[PDB]
Swiss-Prot record:
Portion held of the full protein: 74 to 187 of 801
Result for mutant: residue 83 to A: Abolished binding to histone H4 acetylated at 'Lys-12' (H4K12ac). Abolished binding to histone H4 acetyl-methylated
Role summary: Chromatin reader protein that specifically recognizes and binds histone H4 acetylated at 'Lys-5' and 'Lys-12' (H4K5ac and H4K12ac, respectively), thereby controlling gene expression and remodeling chromatin structures. Recruits transcription factors and coactivators to target gene sites, and activates RNA polymerase II machinery for transcriptional elongation.
Subcellular location: Nucleus; Chromosome
Subunit structure: Homodimer. Interacts with E2F1. Interacts with (acetylated) STAT3; promoting STAT3 recruitment to chromatin. Interacts with CTCF; promoting BRD2 recruitment to chromatin.
Result, substituting residue 81 to A: Partial loss of homodimerization. Abolished binding to histone H4 acetylated at 'Lys-12' (H4K12ac)
Species in which this protein is naturally found: Homo sapiens
Additional remarks: Some specific inhibitors of BRD2 that prevent binding to acetylated histone are promising therapeutic molecules for the treatment of cancers or inflammatory diseases. ABBV-744, a small molecule, has been tested on tumors with success: ABBV-744 antiproliferative activity is mainly restricted to cell lines of acute myeloid leukaemia and prostate cancer and is able to displace BRD4 from chromatin. GSK046 (iBET-BD2), which specifically inhibits the second bromo domain, is a promising therapeutic small molecule for the treatment of inflammatory and autoimmune diseases.
Lineage: Eukaryota, Metazoa, Chordata, Craniata, Vertebrata
Full protein name: Bromodomain-containing protein 2
Impact upon substituting residue 5 to A: Loss of homodimerization
Annotated positions binding a protein: 39, 82-84, 87-88
Amino acid sequence: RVTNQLQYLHKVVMKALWKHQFAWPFRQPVDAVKLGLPDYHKIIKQPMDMGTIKRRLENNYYWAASECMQDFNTMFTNCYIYNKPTDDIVLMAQTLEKIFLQKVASMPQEEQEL
Ligand SMILES: Cc1noc(C)c1-c1cc(-c2c(C)noc2C)c2cccnc2c1
Ligand SMILES: Cc1noc(C)c1-c1cc(-c2c(C)noc2C)c2cccnc2c1
């Protein structure tokens, strides 16, 4: 499916998040071997990242805007659940999610499939 809403999520929301200076740790899946986190996949059952979301948007994977929004949500939530309250990554996530919500507050309201 291809809608006004999904185009907004791609051209406005993803565009803003992807180039952000705090975005780099979220542009690809968490690599638990590289980062030395043997329990990552024990704790986080549904990994998600902006590279995956971007690919899905580019390939018309999503059928509704809410679906894409849930993937953004999962990505941020995984981060808050896995990491320590004091970890810098949490601050970076909060910053990006603030922008996510600000942009989503202005997304087109009715899913005009095109
Ligand atoms: C301008 C213009 N004049 O004719 C058309 C067609 C567009 C257009 C429409 C959408 C569009 C579509 C398709 N659905 O909602 C919107 C907005 C776009 C989306 C992203 C980028 N460029 C877009 C350009
Ligand atoms: C996202 C995410 N969710 O859980 C963790 C853990 C991350 C993370 C954290 C760091 C990170 C940063 C930034 N500083 O310390 C660590 C660890 C990264 C660094 C490079 C690449 N990917 C990284 C991914």
